Amino acid sequence: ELFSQIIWFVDDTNVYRVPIHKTFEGNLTTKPINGAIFIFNPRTGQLFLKIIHTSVWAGQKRLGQLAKWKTAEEVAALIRSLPVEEQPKQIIVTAKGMLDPLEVHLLDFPNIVIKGSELQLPFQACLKVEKFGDLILKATEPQMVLFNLYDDWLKTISSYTAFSRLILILRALHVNNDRAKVILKPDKTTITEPHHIWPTLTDEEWIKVEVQLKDLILAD
């Protein structure tokens, strides 16, 4: 199932980013900031972060549409740089407009099945995590960076449990950033290792955190 085959979630929601601002003259700004494609392996925790520099948009119209195609191009490029045995067997998109661009970009990979999903998996929230947000903001050229979004969790829990824990974190951060961060710091001495994304907590502390995140998402 979702935990067997190499599977990737692809999120395009942060690729083309135009902050909403009204100029002194009363018009909306149109200038983009750097974005990123998130490509996520839910069994291993592996994240490929492709940073999208604003220079790539210079020139053309209907950039929201074009960004779906850019995302697909970059997914295809990643696949071609990997050995066959590391290539995904399934690609899952939560955005419907990704389906046709991916289908056209992956015609050379007949093994790869592309499907849509109604799952709420908001990588948007990673833009609020400073490790990622700063890296994206400050980039001066495109590049790709590797991450392990499960930290050391798989030493003691299953991929299923880790995936659930991550979705709860991202969803909580997405609906209520400030309260999510409070929940994720239960003690003054709670820290996050420099190479980790998330705090170091005991598995009992995580049970309690996970209930509170669920509650926060339910409260909206």
- Can you give the CATH number for the domain in which 103 is found? 3.30.420.230
Contacts of 181 (CB under 8 A, 6+ apart): 173
CATH (domain of 164): 1.20.80.40
Alpha carbon of residue 122 to chain centroid: 7
Q: How far apart are CA 173 and CA 213, in angstroms?
A: 9
> Do residues 11 and 40 touch, judged by C-beta distance below 8 A?
yes
- Do 141 and 45 sit in the same domain of this protein? yes
Name the domain boundary from 118, 134, 151.
Answer: 151
- Do 61 and 165 sit in the same domain of this protein? no
- Do 160 and 135 sit in the same domain of this protein? no
HSE toward the beta carbon, residue 154, CA cutoff 13 A: 12
Name the domain boundary from 98, 129, 151.
Answer: 151
Pairing of strands 90-93, 113-116: parallel
End-to-end alpha carbon distance in the chain: 30
Q: How far apart are CA 70 and CA 57, in angstroms?
A: 10
- Do 34 and 60 sit in the same domain of this protein? yes
Technique used to solve these coordinates: X-ray
Number of structural domains, the chain? 2
- Do 18 and 93 sit in the same domain of this protein? yes
What's the 3-state SS for the chain? Answer: CCCCCCEEEEECCCCCECCCCECCCCCECCCCECEEEEEECCCCCEEEEEEECHHHHCCCCCHHHHHHHHHHHHHHHHHHHCCHHHCCCEEEECCHHHHHHHHHHCCCCCCCEEEECCCCCCHHHHHHCHHHHHHHHHCCCCEEEEEECCCCHHHCCCHHHHHHHHHHHHHHHHHCHHHHHHHCCCCCCCCCCCCCCCCCCCHHHHHHHHHHHHHHHHHC
User: Resolution of the deposited coordinates, in angstroms?
Assistant: 2.0
Q: How far apart are CA 127 and CA 187, in angstroms?
A: 24
Where in the sequence is the domain holding 119, given as residue range(s)? 1-151
- Do 133 and 176 sit in the same domain of this protein? no
- Residue 78 sits at the vertex; the CA angle it makes with 7 and 159, to the nearest 5 degrees, is 25
